[PDB]
Symmetry: C3
Subunit: 231 residues, 3 copies
């Protein structure tokens, strides 16, 4: 484990995702509202999945070597197995908050799968220049997601209860800022141009992951928007 300088950030990430999972699990014990139960189930699964994948990276299972640039490059593939399941769950939290229609939910989840799937292909591609073709396709899929979150959901939240509109607006802004950083870290990190070393890259993804999952969840599950209007 300790033979890799980035191990400290993988261990911290593992701990923070595990602690986040347990807090949400305990906090959700005393909840019977069927609407609130939906948000607790979605939001608790997110850091639980991330916990297992951070642990796999810490123990060395989620790491492979990819030859490109005449070098064997360490690629943590477990990140994409994490994101494949956690990013659509996070979008479902937002879509259920605004009572989005089914067709829009399917478009979001499908574009998200394309985003993560093409990012994985780009991470494992051995022809250096082709890695950035996949990065560009994946980034186009992300821009579609961000467009929908702004010019489809925002207008839908305003016609909703005030507390669900204000909570959505906050979580929307958090998501757009944090998610946009991921393609940048990829491009300048060891998967892309190799400007930033792997140990610093790992620290950046850990800060982003914890903020986008645990921080996101703390804002959502403390809001009254997750409960139905009741007397």
């Amino acid at each position: 484990i300790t033979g890799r300088p980035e191990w400290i950030w993988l261990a911290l990430g593992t701990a923070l995702m595990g602690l986040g999972t347990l807090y949400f699990l305990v906090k959700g014990m005393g909840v019977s509202d069927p609407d609130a139960k939906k948000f607790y189930a979605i939001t608790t699964l997110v850091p639980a999945i991330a916990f297992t994948m951070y642990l796999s990276m810490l123990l060395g299972y989620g790491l492979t070597m990819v030859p490109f640039g005449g070098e064997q490059n360490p690629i943590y593939w477990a990140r994409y197995a994490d994101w494949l399941f956690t990013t659509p769950l996070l979008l479902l939290d937002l879509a259920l908050l605004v009572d989005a229609d089914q067709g829009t939910i399917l478009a979001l989840v499908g574009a998200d799968g394309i985003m993560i799937g093409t990012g994985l292909v780009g991470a494992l591609t051995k022809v250096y220049s082709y890695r950035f073709v996949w990065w560009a396709i994946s980034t186009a899929a992300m821009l579609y997601i961000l467009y929908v979150l702004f010019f489809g959901f925002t207008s839908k939240a305003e016609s909703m209860r005030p507390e669900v509109a204000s909570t959505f607006k906050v979580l929307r802004n958090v998501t757009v800022v944090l998610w946009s950083a991921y393609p940048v870290v990829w491009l300048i990190g060891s998967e892309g141009a190799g400007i930033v070393p792997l140990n610093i890259e790992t620290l950046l993804f850990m800060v982003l992951d914890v903020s986008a999952k645990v921080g996101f969840g703390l804002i959502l599950l403390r809001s009254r928007a997750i409960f139905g209007e009741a007397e």
Copy 2:
């Protein structure tokens, strides 16, 4: 790329799926009917997924070598990753058109997963004679799907609006004819008996894919069956 004679058909397929995706995306911009939005989302995702997998084959990522018959045989595995997601989406288009019940939808999607999954196992199997055992199981799963589309959905469409009944009947006939060709191309192509060479096999799958996805989508999204009855 150009070192493979089949590259021209992979490049054409990539272009036609990309163009198809963009047309459906633009055409769906001016749509607010929640029913129509469902069909546009399903139908636009189909060629978008196929685009990415054709590109992976063009660039050489979606290709592996499988030893059988005393030879290293080029097997494009990316086809099955495509079909795993696009064939159930196409069946969902048909099932939603006739307002099929949930139990029937699950049976269709499950049989479809078995069809594609066993076809993938057959494509990667190293014992030559066993490849055709998997082909037979996969073909049995397809025949179940075709039976349901005829002796379960057809009777359901007649009790529906006339425009949804006539549109379903057309898309049903297109699907049964085109899908039935796939097991035949597999059997006589490089995955099976090896009668037809890979470059011709690739041309045939490209014609079938574009027809079953883009051609299918053009018929559906030009129909009024996708809109609810409104004044």
Copy 3:
């Protein structure tokens, strides 16, 4: 095939899953109740999936070698591909029986995916002591599932029709007893401590699989709880 002593139990399992699939398929022909159709579709898919994965193990495709303990250990990975899809389908049978809320269904299916996913990682892990870390995480996920089936569903079934309450109680008890045996067989078998040899381990999993899928299905599909109350 016959070069492996466990082949006899893989062949028996294949036959019993295939026969089970055909019986459920025939029995479900004469069913039009939309509620009953749901249970028949879920319950017939379970042994059909298991059939294909037992066949892959029989023919040698679903087997790999994992080095640990200074030895190349035969690991049947196809079991986890089976369980990944069949265990959530079995939980869906139970959840639909008691009309569970959506949030609870998602929590069950998500915990089940974590259970199977971490068990697969543990089966393929090359550092011997780490294999049991994954076993423990997977077992914690199972205990969560069992808790929900007892202290969330049981109370919900009592407020239901008497026949659905008594049928659920029976299937609940069958599930908790049979599922609990799996982590024990893993721990003492070739994936874990290696006390029980592989051929005996394979026999035990076959008895458990057939009972948990075909036996489970025979109890459910003979009950009147799967039909709506009708005159």
